[PDB]
Amino acid sequence: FSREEADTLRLKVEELEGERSRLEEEKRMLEAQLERRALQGDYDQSRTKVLHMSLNPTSVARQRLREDHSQLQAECERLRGLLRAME
């Protein structure tokens, strides 16, 4: 009825009040936790990705280094493969 539901509504409204009040307090504390902690610049893969050119100065330099290492490697073998036989 009117007077009845009124009694139940003032109870329902009063309960939602305490909740709303408690939530704000919680929300505040979580906020104080997030701001106070060490991990500040986090990566969110749902909003960000990192792109680059597949072939770039670094991939090229690393490949050159491997080829130079090989070339020097084979040369060292050749030279000792000549000094050995003059004996």
Partner: protein, 195 residues
């Protein structure tokens, strides 16, 4: 005033010269391979190396297209030890794009001269870092990483990358500049001297 397309061009241009300055100053390519030019009221160094010019141009043009589209979040210049892959220096440029500018009907109010004065200050700060950044002691190379919104279509010769973070680093924060459509923040993270 500035438009979305004008802003994207202005920003891409800042990167083209800024990256050249960083490469020269940090000895990533021999100094005799750069030439001097008058730009931004200063005298700046730019490469003459064919392969580098083509690579930088490819990145800068793509950057410009992504800037127009407002989907770029950062540009990072990653300097690493060629042999070990260890990141030794990392210049990070945080980029904020105003996605509403696509819906503009009139060029924004900020003058291109005020924008150029902000960019000149940043470029001068980049060149001023030469008095203290440590000399790299091993052969290094660089790669340009571009952080973008997640739903960007990845062009043909591009691929996903890790973020190449640096460890045991100190930082120098530089001033930001903005066109009111694109705001650019600048900083460099570098290895703590040893000893």
């Amino acid at each position: 005033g500035i438009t979305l397309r004008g802003s994207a061009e202005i920003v891409a241009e800042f990167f083209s010269f800024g990256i050249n300055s960083i490469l020269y100053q940090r000895g990533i390519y021999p100094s005799e391979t750069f030439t001097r030019v008058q730009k931004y009221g200063l005298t700046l160094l730019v490469t003459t190396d064919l392969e580098l010019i083509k690579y930088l141009n490819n990145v800068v043009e793509q950057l410009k297209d992504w800037l127009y589209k407002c989907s770029v979040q950062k540009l990072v210049v990653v300097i690493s030890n060629i042999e070990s892959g260890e990141v030794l220096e990392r210049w990070q440029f945080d980029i904020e794009c105003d996605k509403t500018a696509k819906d503009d009907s009139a060029p924004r109010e900020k003058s291109q001269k005020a924008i150029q004065d902000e960019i000149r200050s940043v470029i001068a700060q980049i060149t001023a870092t030469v008095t203290f950044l440590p000399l790299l002691e091993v052969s290094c190379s660089f790669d340009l990483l571009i952080y973008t919104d997640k739903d960007l279509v990845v062009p043909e010769k591009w691929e996903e990358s890790g973020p190449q973070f640096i460890t045991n680093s100190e930082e120098v924060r530089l001033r930001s500049f903005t066109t009111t459509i694109h705001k650019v923040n600048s900083m460099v993270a570098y290895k703590i001297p040893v000893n």
